[PDB]
Write a protein that binds this ligand. Structure first.
Ligand SMILES: CCCCCCCC/C=C/CCCCCCCC(=O)OC[C@@H](O)CO
Lengths: 28, 28, 28
């Protein structure tokens, strides 16, 4: 179950980076 | 503990995208 | 060990953000 929780953390970081990009476009 | 794990994973990706953007502005 | 679970979540989240930043960098 260790590797699966890593992908969850990796997928969450992938999601957070796109949120940072969408918030930037919201300003632009 | 599960909610905090996915939270800081999203915050890590949210924080990593901003630092990379500031690293990108350093080029140009 | 609730301390190191959060650290790997930060590492996994930062990993995901760098993935997306280089993933979107390919599209250009
Ligand atoms: C704890 C931090 C709180 C917010 C601090 C805000 C001030 C510092 C920086 C502000 C601007 C951040 C913008 C960040 C925008 C998201 C990153 C992005 O778009 O990357 C992809 C692009 O480079 C295109 O390939």
């Amino acid at each position: 179950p260790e590797l699966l929780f890593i992908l969850v953390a990796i997928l969450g970081g992938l999601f957070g980076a796109i949120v940072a990009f969408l918030l930037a476009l919201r300003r632009l």
